[PDB]
């Protein structure tokens, strides 16, 4: 679908943990959260420690 792109609502890191990157997908009219690198769990809660303590 052709939609215009806007940002995520006020509770952007609401369900999406560790400051999760909430975005809209304009093409499909869906939402998602993208996770940062070195963060683990299905919900992206935790940090992988080993690279820090190197």
From Swiss-Prot:
Residues 8-45 form the EGF-like domain. Disulfide bonds join 8-22, 16-33, 35-44. This is Epidermal growth factor. The chain holds residues 976 to 1022 of 1207 of the full protein.
């Amino acid at each position: 679908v052709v939609s215009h792109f806007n940002d995520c609502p006020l509770s952007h890191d609401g369900y999406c943990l560790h400051d999760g990157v909430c975005m809209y997908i304009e093409a499909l009219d869906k939402y998602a959260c993208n996770c940062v690198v070195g963060y683990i769990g299905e919900r992206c809660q935790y940090r992988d420690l080993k690279w820090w303590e190197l």
